[model samples]
Structure formats: C-alpha cells, structure tokens
Target: KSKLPKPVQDLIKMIFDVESMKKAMVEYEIDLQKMPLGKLSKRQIQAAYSILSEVQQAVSQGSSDSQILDLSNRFYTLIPHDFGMKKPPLLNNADSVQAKAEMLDNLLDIEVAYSLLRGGSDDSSKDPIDVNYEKLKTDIKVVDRDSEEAEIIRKYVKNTHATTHNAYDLEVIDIFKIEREGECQRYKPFKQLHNRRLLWHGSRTTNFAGILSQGLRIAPPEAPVTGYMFGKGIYFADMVSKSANYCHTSQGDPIGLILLGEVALGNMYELKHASHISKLPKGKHSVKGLGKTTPDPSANISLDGVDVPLGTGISSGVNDTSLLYNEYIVYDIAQVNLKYLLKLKFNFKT
Candidate 1:
C-alpha cells in the first residue's frame, strides 16, 4: 500500500469513490421515483437531495471499465442465409414472438411416458432400451425419426416437462435448418450440445421462417395442465437474486430465444430484408452473458421495455429448470491478443 506515491493514492481513492457513487445514484433515482418527497417534511426531503449531489464526482470522472471486448456477438434483424443485402437492425434481449406450430407438443408427452415404460423401465439393464441416449442430445446429430420408436420418442418430447435433471432431444421432421441472419449468436445448437427439457415452442428452422421468443403450453393427458416457456421469461432480479444460465439449463445443449419488444411486426419483418445500405449503431455486440455469473441483458437498463432490476450475488437453492440458486460466473478475460475478447465486430454482407 505504501509503494504508491501520495498523488497516486489520492487518485485511487477518487476512482473508488466514483464507482460507489454511480451505484448510489441508481438507487437514489429509484427511491425518488417510488416515493414522492414533495408531500413529506422538508428536512427529510433535503437529506435525500443532498446525497445526489455528493455522488456527482463519479459521473464527472466518466467510465473506468471502458475496455472493449474482442469477441463479438450480435442479433441482426434479418435471415442469415441472405448474406447479399442490407439487413435491418434486430432488437436485443427484447423478445419477439416465438409460437408453436402443428401444436403436437402433447403427443410428445405421451411418447415420453411410453419410453419410460418400455425403454425407461428400471429393469431395462438387461434388455437395454436400444435408445441411442446420445442422439437425445442437442445438435449432435438428428435422431432417425423414421423408426417407429423414434416417432414414439418424438411424441414424448412434445408433451414432457422434465426436471432440471431431465434429458431429451427436439425432433424437427421434414426439416432443413433455421438460420438467424443477424449479428447475434445463440445458446448452442440443440443437436451439437444435447439440450435437455425444452419448455419452449416455435419452429425457427423447420416451418416458421421467422421466429422469436419461447412459449411453452402443456395441455392435459400428459402434463398437469400448465404451460411453461424455457425462454420468454420474467424473474425478480433482487427478490430471486438467483442467476439463470444456459450451460446449466442447456446442460451443455444450447437453447436460446430472440426477445422482441413493441416494435412493429411489419418493421420486424423488414428487418429480415437484405439490402446494400449501412449505418453504424451503438451497442452493436448486443449479446448478453450466460448465467448469474455473467452480465445480464437487464443491465442494459436504458433499453426500452426492460424492467428487471439488478440482483445481489446469489440465492440459496436450485431453481426451476437448470438455473442455479447461486452466483458463480466466467467471462472473456483480457490478455495479450490480436483482437478484443468479448465485443463484436460488425460488417454487412450486402
């Protein structure tokens, strides 16, 4: 501590004060909005206003962690296959509409039960259900859906809601591939990663050419009659204090959604258009981190329609899905490198 000169020591203290001041300003702004002081005693009101001024030093000092990320991520507002035109800007954690087509999610539940009975029996050690279990993973390879048993398994995934411990694969019959024509990268591919329970809906790569968000509805006969979305979620940032993560929820399989906002469905449609025009926008990387350990999409507090507050460190129990009740995270670390670590670089194909 004594190694630093007096000027350096003063500079360090000044920087630390600003960081704390910024945090306090955010709290003070919230309190002022929720509680109207014009009605309270002037003395009590004066105390609050005084605190706001004392924190001004931090704002004047500007940003500290301004180092940019080298790695990039983006959700361009267009289909990815058409790399020949100008694509409109896509929204951020703002979710778009992701729906269920064919509504066969129910058939999936019955099939899962059938698997548990036939292939899942605790007694199957000798016979071996013959299930590849490996294919039940995300993005590894498509399960041969032609087999009668594969059909049965397809019916099961359509209806089952496994615990944070359940494992399964999503089958897209008569499908090619869904592409996101934008700057955003997603959780991981289901097949390549082997996603577990998908309380999600919609066919982005199958029939739904345009897709957004995750909405899951569980009809009767298979589940207990409640629908849940693996995405399109809302949780109290401070109240829950738990961090949700993809690696945990994905269990290694990648599952993610594109959040949309009040933007026009028509404008959103245009976002998928490919043209040759270009303009630079701020916050271009736009992708958020994976878990409580990572930064939150909500941290873009200035983002429209975003309302989740910042949470404390972590909570104390395992939550629904694979989300942990605690906080532990990893990030792109800085080191000797040719490019940035976490920020995205933008270039239009057209």
Candidate 2:
C-alpha cells in the first residue's frame, strides 16, 4: 500500500520515465549512440549555444548561402543530429535556428535526470517509486480534497477554461503543493513586489524534471528574439486553457501537468499586437499581451496575500487584438515562485 495518493503516484511515474526521455531524444533526431543521456555534458550544450548565436547573427545579417550552410554543418557535426539517409536541413532561417536552441534546452534537463539516476546508490530493496521521487530534490505534498486551497485552485481551473477553442474537457485530477529546493531563496527578493498574482504555466511532461530542478527559465540569448512572441521571457497566462495548450497532449496520451506561480508583476507594458521587443521600458517589470477577453476584475480574490484571478471570462473592452487571451511575460526568471503543480486529464471530445 503506497502512502502517496493514486494521482500523485501516476505523476511520479510519468515525470521520471527514462523511456519517455529517450523517446523525446529520438524524436529530436539526436544520435543516441554517440551522445547518450549520461554522456551529455554541460560544455557540449554551452558550445552548441555559442554555435546557435552565430547562426542567428548570420540569418539576421542576410549572410551568403554558403556561409549559412557551413555554419549548419558545424552545428550538426558538434551535436551529431541524426537525419539518417536524408540530407540534414540547413539551419538557415530563424525557425530552424530556434528549433535547435529549444532542443538544447530539453537536452540540458535530460542530462540532469540521467545524472541523478546514475548517481543514486544501488539498493535493490528500495521501491522504484520511492527512488524516483527522491531524485526530484523537490517536496511535493498532495492537497486534501476538502481543503480551502484545493477549492481555490479548482475554481481557477473551472472559471478560466475557455468555452470556445477548447478541443477537450479538462478535469483536475490532483493538485500538489511543490516546494522546490532553494527556490524560495532565489525568489525572495521579488516577494514584496506590487501586483503579485498567481499565474499559470504549462509544459510537456518530459520537461518537468528540468523545470523542477532548475526552475522556470527565460529563453537563452542565443535563441532568436522572434522565436518568442514577446521577446525572450518566461511566459504565463491568466486563462488556464491558454497555458494548457502548451502541454502538447494527444488523444492517446491525454495526461498533462501545469504550474501555478506567484508572479511579481510590478508594472506592466501592455501590447495589443505582436512586438519582438528585447528590452522593457524604464520601470516596467513585465509585458502583458492584452486580449479581448480576460478574467472579470470584480470577481478577483486573494489567497495567502497573493491575488487569485478566478473570475469567469469577460470582455476586456479591447475589441482589436492579436491574442484571444492574456499572456504575461517576465524577462527575469527570479520573478516567478512556483506554488502548485496540477495533474490534468484532457478528455478529447471528438
């Protein structure tokens, strides 16, 4: 009889899944034989980042085709991407350059997970579930079903779910209060910042190990600014479904994880259209992509001194905007203090 709740146990199984990690690497076309997860080194990832930076500069400068091809070949040689019999594509455009950079990001986390597993002492008597849970280096406690905290989180999920554009029905199967080691110390300086609110962030299950170990990160400098909608920043959303879409779940694998973070959004620079801004204006703390629909302001509530915008969706009186729901982007990674991790099941309607 495992002491952990059923949903929590299921989440642990998914997060520490070695097979899934390897599957992701295979999908990314990485040469597993040459660069196994355990063999992935920080120096290699850093070198890859340097190459990406050069590629981005070349793409932006409209460099000659030969120069771009040469740089692409250098990157492939260094990282050993396996394209099999087909010719490897040139990393000539902003999209291809961005794609490789994101792959490096995922590889870093995979490295962390593999290192932890390899470093663990051999103890055949121990349960595998306990072994995997101990490697996370984060404390996860299941919130009681009848607790006030659970009610608040459930309300946020229910009200912010979009009626339109939703492809599946969402049900919160579990909510775990996460205290990632040393995260509080990193986020302490921003704790007193004004307009701090609980915001939603979603990522694929394969990425949670890195996210838990390293915390939410901003895009690296080597990644192109155009890769991100609002420059290279950590993006969050008030609407649950908006962030949920990033989980990239399929009909076959419908389970996903999402985080609620205490974001220190002091002053916002609002945008109605896409802007590839690399810097924020003076005194602005974050960027807000103003949407036509947002949570109702009057219905906002507070929990633990942090604002919880659990209000139902309502018009923001802004008729013309590129986005359908609000997106919050913080350029600084320390501005986010992750609070809770929720396991959600996406019941595909079609």
Candidate 3:
C-alpha cells in the first residue's frame, strides 16, 4: 500500500514529470538532439537571455531589417530551435520578442529540473518516484481536509472566485503546506513590513520544481522591459480565477496548482493601466493593478496574523481601470513568503 495520499502522489507525479518536461521543450520547438535535457546548462540559457535582450533593443530602436534578421539568426544558432523545412521566425516585433523572453524563462526552469534529475548519485534500488521526490528540495505536506487551515483556504477560493466570462468552477483537490528550505530565512527581513496580505499565484505544473526550489522570480535583465504588464515583477492576484488563468490549463487537462503567498505589500502604488516600470517611487513597496471588482475589505480575515482577502467580489469605488480583477506585483522576490500550494480541478461548463 502507498503511504502517500492520492493527491500527494498526483502532485509528485506532475511536478517531476519527465515526459511533460520533454513535451514543453518540444512545444517550444527546441532542437532536442542539439540540446537534450541532460545537456541544458545555465550558461546556455543565459546566452539565450542575452540574445533576447538584444532582440528587444533592436526591435524598439527600429533597427534595420538586416540587423534584426542577423540577431534572429544568432539567437537560433545559439538556442537551436527546430523548424524543419520552414524558415525561422524573425524576432522583430514586440510580440515575438516577448515570446522568446518567456521561452527563455521556461527553459531556465527546464534546466533546473533536468539538473536535479541527474544530481542524484547512482542508486539503482531506489524507486523512481522516491528518487524524483527527493530532488524537490522542499517539503510538501498535505493539509488535512478537516483542518482549520483547509477551511480557510476553501473559503478564500470560494469567496474570491470570479463570476465573469473568464470564470470556471474550481474544486480544491489538495492543499499542501510548502516549506521551501531557506525561504523563511530569505523572507525574514520583510516579515515586519505592514499591509501584508495572503494572495494567489498560479503557474504551470512543469514549472513547480524550479519555482519551489528557487522561489518566484522576476524576468532576467536581458528580458524585454515591455514583456510584463506591471513591469518585470513576481505577480499575484486577489481573485482566484485571475491567477488560475495563468496556470494555462485546458479542458482536456484541467487540473492545476495555485500558490497562496504572504506578500509584504508595505505600500502599494496603484495604477489604472499598464506601466512598464523598472523602478518604484520612494516609499512604494509594490504595484497594484486596480480592477473593476475586488474583494470586500470589510469581510477580510486574518490567518496566522496575515490578512486573507477571502471576501466575495465587490465593485471597487475606482471607476477607471483597465483590469477586471486585481493584480499585485512585487519587484523584489523576497517580499513573498509562500504559504500554501493548492491542487485544483477546473470544471469547465459545456
């Protein structure tokens, strides 16, 4: 009999899934023969990031077409994206530049996953599942269904769920308390900062191993400044669905994971529209992308002294805003203390 719960087993399977990792690489059109997972290196990813940065700069400067094409060729030469008989895309526009930047981000995580997979010493007797589990460098323990913590989390999901065109009913399968080694130590300095809130951050299952190990990160300096809506920062959401959409799940494969983070949003610089800011004004700790609907502040509750915005959606008094739901961005990764990871099943309405 398995000692692990079914959800825990599922979490382990998805997070360390070698097949899905390979699939992600294939989807990115990476030439696996030229750059296999085992062969992926941080230096190579860094080189790719540098190339992307140049592409971003060239596109913004309206550089000559030949110059952009040359940069594009150099990028493909460095990264080796497989295009078969078709010509490679020219990274001459904002969209293409942003896409390549995101690809490099994913590639960095893929490299981490691969590195950990090979880090283990040869121990042929170990179960592959156990072996993969050992590589996470983080402890993931299932929160009991009947526990108070679980109740609070369920309420957070239910209350903050959106009732818009983007809405999908969510079923919480498992709630795991994550203790990423040294995360608390890194977050120690910001622990006393006020306006701290528990918020949501969702991402692909393929990225969890890296995220859990390294923590959520900002885009590399080489990444295009225009790539992020609220600048290159680690983003969080108040409404569950806003962040859930970032999970990039499909009806065919609807299960996803979302994180609850204790964010030290000491002082928010709220904005109505996109601003690709690289620096915050003095005393501003983070950025809040104002939305039409936000959680009712009166209904907010505190868990372990951290405010949980577990209130039902209500219209914010702010009338002019580009977003429908709130987004929080922290430029400094240390401002976030990851609290929980929830495995969710997105039930699509036919």
After superposing candidate 1, which stretches have Cα over 4 Å from the reference?
1-302, 310-313, 316-323, 326-350
lDDT of 3 by residue, 1-350 (tens): 34566776778888877888888899899999987878779997788778777877777688898998898888888788888998888888788977888888888887788788778787877776666776777888889999999999999999998889445689998899998888999999999889889999999888898988889987766667776788889899999988998887878778888999999999999999999976899999999999999999999998988999999999998887889988999999999999899989998887
Q: 100, model 2: CA deviation in Å?
A: 1.7
* Candidate 3: Cα lDDT at 183: 90
Candidate 2 residue-wise lDDT, 1-350, digit = tens? 45666766787888877887888899899999987777787788888889889888887789998998888888887788787899998888778877888888888777777776667888888776777777787888999989999999999999999887568888998899999998889889999989999999999888898788779987766566766788888999999999999886888789889999999998999999888886998999999999989999999998988999999999998878999899999998889999999999999998
Clashes of each: 50, 0, 0
Ranking of all predicted structures according to lDDT, beginning with the best and ending with the worst: 2, 3, 1
lDDT for each candidate structure: 0.22, 0.87, 0.86
TM per candidate comes to 0.17, 0.91, 0.92
Residue 55's lDDT within candidate 3 is: 78
Per-residue lDDT over 1-350 for candidate 1, one digit per residue giving the tens place of the 0 to 100 score: 13433432332232223233223223322232333222223343233223222222223354232211100011111111122354432211112101111122321222232233234335334422223221122111222437653443333233221233124333323211122222123322211221111111222111111111111122222221113222112211121112112212233223221111111111110111122222213422111112323223233232123222232333233223233222111111110001000000111122
- Looking at model 2, the pairs that clash are none
Tell me how candidate 1 scores on lDDT: 0.22
Q: Is candidate 2 or 3 superior in TM-score?
A: 3
Model 1 poorest ten-residue lDDT run = 335-344
69 Cα displacement, candidate 3 (Å): 2.9
Instruction: Give the clashing residue pairs of candidate 3, or none.
Output: none
